[PDB]
Amino acid sequence: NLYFQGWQENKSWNAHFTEHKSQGVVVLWNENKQQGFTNNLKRANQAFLPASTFKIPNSLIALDLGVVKDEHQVFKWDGQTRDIATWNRDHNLITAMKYSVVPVYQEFARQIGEARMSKMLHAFDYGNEDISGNVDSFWLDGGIRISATEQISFLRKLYHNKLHVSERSQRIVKQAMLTEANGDYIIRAKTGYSTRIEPKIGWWVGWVELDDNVWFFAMNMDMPTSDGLGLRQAITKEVLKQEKIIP
Numbered sequence: 001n002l003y004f005q006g007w008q009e010n011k012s013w014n015a016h017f018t019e020h021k022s023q024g025v026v027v028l029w030n031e032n033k034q035q036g037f038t039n040n041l042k043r044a045n046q047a048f049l050p051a052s053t054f055k056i057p058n059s060l061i062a063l064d065l066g067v068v069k070d071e072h073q074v075f076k077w078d079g080q081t082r083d084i085a086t087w088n089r090d091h092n093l094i095t096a097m098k099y100s101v102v103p104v105y106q107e108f109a110r111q112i113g114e115a116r117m118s119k120m121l122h123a124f125d126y127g128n129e130d131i132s133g134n135v136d137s138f139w140l141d142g143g144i145r146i147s148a149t150e151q152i153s154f155l156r157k158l159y160h161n162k163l164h165v166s167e168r169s170q171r172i173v174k175q176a177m178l179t180e181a182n183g184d185y186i187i188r189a190k191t192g193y194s195t196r197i198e199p200k201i202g203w204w205v206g207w208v209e210l211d212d213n214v215w216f217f218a219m220n221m222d223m224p225t226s227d228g229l230g231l232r233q234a235i236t237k238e239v240l241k242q243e244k245i246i247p
């Protein structure tokens, strides 16, 4: 009923990791040609905590259930001064995602509740579909795990409005995922940094929109310290540049 030609390996991309003495994986998917490429087929399929990349499915469910009315609704800061300054202020869905404001999304999670969260992730075919742990932190220190190639599968459904939520919900999240746009490309993506449970990793998942194609990407990389957080985007763009996807 369905055909997949199989990922193609390209170890030459490891130079962009070793150049910064880093370890990780980049996965690319050419949508027009239905071809996949990665520097490490084993790590492409290794599943990790999604950490803040969970804001994508969390946003979708919150919108679809009415927990979030639209992208303008204001979520008032609760008063708790936290170590990331941009969290210590009011937010809407756009800025809550831009600044990765965990406490706003923890509230979403509590209002969604266990049963609806579990049912929706099953409908999404998201990762291992396991929400064991605190309803408001399981994507940070509980049971859910997702690999880079699984992030691509999920993102392809979101891109095509094929997830089992409303088209509007999907359009709103793709708007909030907007990260960069110029005359050559649009990037819709979400960063992540998983620290509560070993191993500490950085994530960047999303896609590059071109005039007549879309390249999906999912990367993660070992991140012992926050010093190399910028390497998530930098390494990914080096691979994009090498493959001639962006100038």
Ligand SMILES: *C(=O)[C@@H]([C@@H]1NC(C(=O)O)=C(S[C@@H]2CN[C@H](C(=O)N(C)C)C2)[C@@H]1C)[C@@H](C)O
Pocket: 050, 051, 052, 053, 084, 099, 100, 102, 140, 190, 191, 192, 193, 194, 229, 230
């Ligand atoms: C998500 O995984 C964690 C938060 N999300 C992110 C992120 O998207 O990178 C961070 S990192 C923090 C916020 N922005 C700063 C940054 O990106 N640089 C200085 C480069 C640092 C949060 C930790 C969530 C689980 O806390």
Ligand SMILES: [Cl-]
Pocket: 051, 052, 053, 054, 055, 101, 102, 105
């Ligand atoms: Cl989060």
Ligand SMILES: [Cl-]
Pocket: 174, 175, 178
């Ligand atoms: Cl947009």
